[PDB]
Amino acid sequence: KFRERLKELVVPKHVMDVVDEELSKLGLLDNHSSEFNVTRNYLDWLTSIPWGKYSNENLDLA
Amino acid sequence: IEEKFRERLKELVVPKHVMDVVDEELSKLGLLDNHSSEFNVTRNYLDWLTSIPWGKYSNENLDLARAQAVLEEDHYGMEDVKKRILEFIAVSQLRGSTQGKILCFYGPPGVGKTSIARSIARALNREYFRFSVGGMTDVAEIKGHRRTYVGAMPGKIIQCLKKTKTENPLILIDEVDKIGRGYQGDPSSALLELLDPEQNANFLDHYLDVPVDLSKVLFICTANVTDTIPEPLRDRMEMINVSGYVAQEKLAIAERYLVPQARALCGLDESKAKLSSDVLTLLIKQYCRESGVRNLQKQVEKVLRKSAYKIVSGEAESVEVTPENLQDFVGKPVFTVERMYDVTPPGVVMGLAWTAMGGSTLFVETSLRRPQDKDGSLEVTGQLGEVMKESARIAYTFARAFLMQHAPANDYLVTSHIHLHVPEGATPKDGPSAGCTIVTALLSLAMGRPVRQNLAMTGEVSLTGKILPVGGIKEKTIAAKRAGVTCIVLPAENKKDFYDLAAFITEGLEVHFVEHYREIFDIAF
Ligand SMILES: Nc1ncnc2c1ncn2[C@@H]1O[C@H](COP(=O)(O)OP(=O)(O)O)[C@@H](O)[C@H]1O
Ligand SMILES: [Mg+2]
């Protein structure tokens, strides 16, 4: 479910190789627990940050 | 037990960002063991999350008539604070929704800054809560501790919201100027998080771990001096100066509030112990000349307790106080004499001075130091400051110049040696307010003519004789009226200060406003 939030966003490898590991850790931990909550937050706000989104700068001085 | 937490949430319009936390916490409660410690901490966390009010606002009374009637019911004479509150209601009617401000009341002790908060809350129909940050050393009182700790509890603000059960109460933060800058976490940083509109809307408590909207609460902060509140804090809250009370106002509170309450806490009826208006006015004049009302309360309580002792001991069945025997109850008068001179000799002129204990009268005496009908000199004594010494020099030069043209044949000032004294040796005095008084004293000594016998004056003088505005007009006017002055001279630039005063202060004074000293010369001679 977290992967779809970065499907349309370019993600660097050095964090993508941690996203899947943390997702596996979430999938092996028991539901609704302290460690589960921490891993849920960590996955959520890895997949929420805009790795591949760049705002267009204004090139015109006018 | 989950159904109880669920039913507690029916009347609350809970925001999603905390409703989703509540849902998973109930899930954890449904997954944990019955007697586990983690179960207990989770259940306490849900109790706190469901007891905090979400969306509940008290029915704020908006009627500007009923609110006002509440304001004058409890406190007398605090016009500025009452007007500020009634213009909070107005602005919150024209906007439509309950609004919040962060208001700071500062002033001398015992003027009603702390007590008016309850009356304001009553007028607004808002829940009232008070906590004092004086001597506060740690941040855990405001922001709490993480719930992972054994004895974790939320901060003062969360307990306030839980007790008041409304999201728009009146929170009185007392002694914000004396908050202690502790080592392990400065609580002033948390006060900055509370008193900041851009972030108080999502104030986060360590125990709750969720933000709460404190933009609707009316923070009232009470302080003594504005010079020592932290700089990022004092710039984000409106400063309202609660000034002290004049003698007539003090009489009003005494007759209306202080004496009845003292009788209630003493048991003496008006028949057993008589306290007429004249006795109270004498107490104000001679003993209670401060700015607050605590000294007046203590004096009234002293009189009533001495009357109670007289009644209980069987010395008398009733005690009646008179101005002839008030000193038998309250001892030696603090201010027994208002003016040194009743009829001024030629060399002296009456002036006015500012003082914390109300206005003060000063006289300027000049005398001939050496026998004479090379040049003259002026000796100056009286613990006069450097600025006042310079003012005396300027006044001496202008007096010489003025007498050179008004009375060309009169060479008294340029040849005679003169000593000028302000007769209070132990008290230091400073400021240029006495320039016109010094000029008048020198000219009256030179001409051998006393000034008007009920005249007082104050005002800075230039080298060419122009009169400049001076400060402390209220205190000087009060001192003049108290000392029986009928005619007072003021700079023309102080007309707005003089007419800003209450009508009962300036009622009996024949005030004159002047631009140049020649007008003062025409008035005094
Ligand atoms: N204007 C006033 N009218 C009536 N009572 C007053 C007034 N100002 C102060 N008081 C009384 O003084 C007492 C203490 O005042 P307080 O609120 O402590 O002043 P401060 O906040 O300056 O310390 C209160 O019980 C209150 O009844
Ligand atoms: Mg107070």
Side-chain angles (χ1 to χ4, degrees):
Chain A
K1 55 190 179 183
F2 300 99
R3 290 179 174 152
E4 190 151 63
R5 294 170 72 196
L6 54 82
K7 178 180 283 181
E8 296 293 334
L9 185 143
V10 181
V11 179
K13 199 191 75 76
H14 72 289
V15 71
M16 187 66 204
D17 57 23
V18 181
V19 167
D20 56 1
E21 182 174 35
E22 296 290 311
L23 189 145
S24 78
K25 189 176 64 186
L26 192 88
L28 61 84
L29 285 173
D30 62 358
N31 197 3
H32 294 112
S33 181
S34 54
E35 296 299 327
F36 182 76
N37 166 56
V38 172
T39 308
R40 183 178 181 270
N41 294 4
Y42 191 107
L43 294 174
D44 180 32
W45 171 23
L46 294 174
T47 196
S48 59
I49 49 182
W51 285 132
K53 298 291 180 68
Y54 292 165
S55 67
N56 290 321
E57 279 200 307
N58 166 49
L59 276 300
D60 287 354
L61 301 172
Chain B
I1 70 174
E2 54 269 49
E3 71 289 336
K4 179 253 191 174
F5 292 164
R6 289 295 192 194
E7 61 86 20
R8 190 183 278 170
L9 295 164
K10 294 181 176 67
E11 65 183 1
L12 303 181
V13 297
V14 62
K16 182 174 72 68
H17 63 87
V18 65
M19 194 39 204
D20 56 23
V21 180
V22 172
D23 279 340
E24 58 208 4
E25 293 302 324
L26 276 296
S27 82
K28 267 160 35 180
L29 197 146
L31 299 190
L32 266 52
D33 210 325
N34 189 261
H35 281 94
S36 180
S37 57
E38 188 68 27
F39 181 76
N40 281 281
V41 70
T42 301
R43 184 176 179 179
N44 183 232
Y45 185 48
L46 294 174
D47 200 36
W48 272 102
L49 279 168
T50 59
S51 297
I52 188 76
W54 301 109
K56 286 183 64 169
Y57 304 119
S58 73
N59 193 53
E60 171 176 322
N61 158 73
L62 286 183
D63 190 23
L64 274 176
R66 193 209 74 91
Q68 187 174 353
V70 170
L71 276 296
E72 293 83 4
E73 183 178 1
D74 281 287
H75 286 73
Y76 178 92
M78 299 165 75
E79 303 302 331
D80 291 331
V81 188
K82 297 173 176 175
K83 288 167 74 175
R84 183 63 189 90
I85 296 302
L86 297 165
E87 287 160 12
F88 165 91
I89 313 173
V91 161
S92 304
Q93 271 158 107
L94 277 197
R95 278 239 274 204
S97 64
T98 67
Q99 86 173 343
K101 284 273 165 297
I102 305 164
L103 294 180
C104 186
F105 299 158
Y106 76 98
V111 300
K113 299 168 293 178
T114 315
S115 54
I116 194 170
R118 195 184 294 276
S119 76
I120 293 168
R122 191 168 65 99
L124 294 171
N125 201 45
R126 282 183 176 229
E127 301 295 328
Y128 171 77
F129 188 88
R130 174 187 173 276
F131 72 100
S132 168
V133 301
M136 183 177 176
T137 65
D138 72 319
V139 75
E141 295 291 331
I142 292 172
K143 287 179 72 76
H145 285 120
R146 284 85 170 93
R147 65 191 177 284
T148 60
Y149 295 116
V150 164
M153 300 172 327
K156 288 290 184 67
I157 305 298
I158 301 313
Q159 303 258 10
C160 176
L161 265 63
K162 177 176 182 288
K163 293 182 183 293
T164 56
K165 308 199 243 204
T166 75
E167 289 202 285
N168 61 327
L170 197 161
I171 294 185
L172 170 63
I173 312 190
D174 209 5
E175 314 291 352
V176 296
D177 52 353
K178 295 170 206 73
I179 178 163
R181 281 69 160 184
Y183 306 119
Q184 301 197 330
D186 190 348
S188 69
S189 72
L191 281 195
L192 183 63
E193 199 180 332
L194 294 170
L195 313 185
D196 190 22
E198 306 87 300
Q199 58 185 313
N200 64 5
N202 290 318
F203 170 86
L204 188 153
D205 193 286
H206 297 160
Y207 184 91
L208 292 175
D209 211 6
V210 296
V212 291
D213 187 0
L214 305 177
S215 64
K216 300 289 94 176
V217 298
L218 173 56
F219 281 107
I220 300 194
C221 297
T222 293
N224 189 359
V225 295
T226 188
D227 299 331
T228 193
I229 294 91
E231 184 77 340
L233 202 73
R234 63 207 281 270
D235 292 331
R236 293 180 181 177
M237 44 162 183
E238 183 178 1
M239 295 296 172
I240 294 93
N241 183 49
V242 189
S243 58
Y245 307 104
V246 308
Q248 299 86 358
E249 302 181 295
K250 285 208 192 194
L251 177 70
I253 296 89
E255 285 183 330
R256 203 174 302 185
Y257 300 107
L258 299 180
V259 175
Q261 291 166 358
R263 288 180 182 287
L265 282 71
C266 179
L268 284 182
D269 302 333
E270 189 71 48
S271 58
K272 287 186 179 181
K274 184 178 184 293
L275 264 170
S276 47
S277 314
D278 53 4
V279 171
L280 295 175
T281 50
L282 193 65
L283 270 178
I284 301 299
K285 188 170 61 175
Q286 288 185 345
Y287 300 82
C288 311
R289 215 170 277 199
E290 67 157 2
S291 60
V293 305
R294 281 208 189 82
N295 196 13
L296 174 60
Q297 219 171 33
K298 276 182 271 171
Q299 297 311 318
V300 167
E301 286 192 324
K302 187 166 183 182
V303 177
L304 286 182
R305 77 190 186 223
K306 278 173 154 52
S307 305
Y309 176 74
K310 284 177 166 68
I311 287 161
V312 173
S313 66
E315 180 171 326
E317 293 82 3
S318 174
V319 183
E320 190 276 331
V321 191
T322 62
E324 285 74 29
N325 75 336
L326 178 62
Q327 70 176 6
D328 299 353
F329 294 84
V330 298
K332 182 199 170 72
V334 186
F335 311 93
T336 185
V337 164
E338 305 307 330
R339 58 191 288 179
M340 279 166 36
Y341 286 88
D342 293 345
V343 175
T344 58
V348 303
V349 172
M350 188 186 171
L352 305 164
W354 176 94
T355 301
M357 293 303 126
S360 184
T361 300
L362 64 84
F363 282 78
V364 170
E365 312 168 309
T366 62
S367 187
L368 190 64
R369 212 180 75 233
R370 289 171 58 178
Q372 183 62 255
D373 190 7
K374 60 178 171 66
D375 71 326
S377 66
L378 186 80
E379 177 165 4
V380 166
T381 58
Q383 289 282 105
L384 270 58
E386 294 294 328
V387 189
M388 177 150 177
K389 281 167 174 282
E390 282 185 288
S391 180
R393 299 301 299 179
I394 300 152
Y396 188 45
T397 307
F398 172 65
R400 287 179 169 214
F402 185 95
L403 195 66
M404 266 189 273
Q405 63 84 30
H406 175 272
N410 190 350
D411 62 347
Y412 185 100
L413 287 172
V414 293
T415 56
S416 303
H417 300 277
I418 298 168
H419 185 170
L420 188 153
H421 178 52
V422 190
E424 198 176 48
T427 59
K429 49 191 71 64
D430 202 11
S433 295
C436 62
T437 307
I438 294 163
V439 179
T440 315
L442 292 160
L443 289 169
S444 70
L445 181 69
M447 296 180 330
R449 286 185 61 192
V451 302
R452 278 182 63 167
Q453 294 293 354
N454 290 77
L455 172 70
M457 49 178 72
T458 183
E460 171 167 10
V461 70
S462 302
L463 191 63
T464 66
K466 277 183 172 272
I467 306 302
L468 272 62
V470 295
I473 297 297
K474 183 170 71 173
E475 280 70 33
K476 292 173 180 167
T477 299
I478 289 169
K481 189 80 175 301
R482 197 200 303 133
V485 175
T486 60
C487 174
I488 185 174
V489 168
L490 292 177
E493 276 76 37
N494 286 121
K495 192 173 298 186
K496 300 289 94 175
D497 314 286
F498 183 83
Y499 287 122
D500 200 328
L501 306 183
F504 57 79
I505 300 180
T506 62
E507 65 183 1
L509 288 164
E510 182 198 339
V511 62
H512 293 96
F513 300 101
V514 298
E515 303 279 358
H516 188 276
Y517 185 83
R518 73 180 76 84
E519 303 173 275
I520 303 192
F521 189 85
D522 288 345
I523 290 159
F525 302 106

